[PDB]
């Protein structure tokens, strides 16, 4: 069929932060193959002028929101792996 690319699962934002963020996500994987420093790359990337602290996670499903709930958070496949990024104080 006629694919696309990184897919997004739950993101609840602007495409703005949701769009420049799943950008450094995408361009991140499509960038380093350390899934661990892709993610951590990510947060760094953001958290570092933006607000931070930022955690990410890199498992393969997050199943929480009414128990962890955070302030901006974006769950979605990059390349061919989960990520689950959200900034939690």
Same mark, same amino acid.
């Given at each position: 069929?006629?694919?696309?690319?990184?897919?997004?699962?739950?993101?609840?934002?602007?495409?703005?932060?949701?769009?420049?963020?799943?950008? @450094?996500?995408?361009?991140? /994987?499509?960038?380093?193959?350390?899934?661990?420093?892709?993610?951590?790359?990510?947060?760094?990337?953001?958290?570092?002028?933006?607000?931070?602290?930022?955690? @990410?996670?890199?498992?393969?499903?997050? +199943?929480?929101?009414?128990?962890?709930?955070?302030?901006?958070?974006?769950?979605?496949? /990059?390349?061919?792996?989960?990520? /689950? /990024?959200?900034?939690? +104080?």
């Amino acid at each position: 069929m006629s694919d696309r690319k990184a897919v997004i699962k739950n993101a609840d934002m602007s495409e703005e932060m949701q769009q420049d963020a799943v950008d @450094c996500a995408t361009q991140a /994987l499509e960038k380093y193959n350390i899934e661990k420093d892709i993610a951590a790359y990510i947060k760094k990337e953001f958290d570092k002028k933006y607000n931070p602290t930022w955690h @990410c996670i890199v498992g393969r499903n997050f +199943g929480s929101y009414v128990t962890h709930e955070t302030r901006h958070f974006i769950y979605f496949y /990059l390349g061919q792996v989960a990520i /689950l /990024l959200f900034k939690s +104080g």
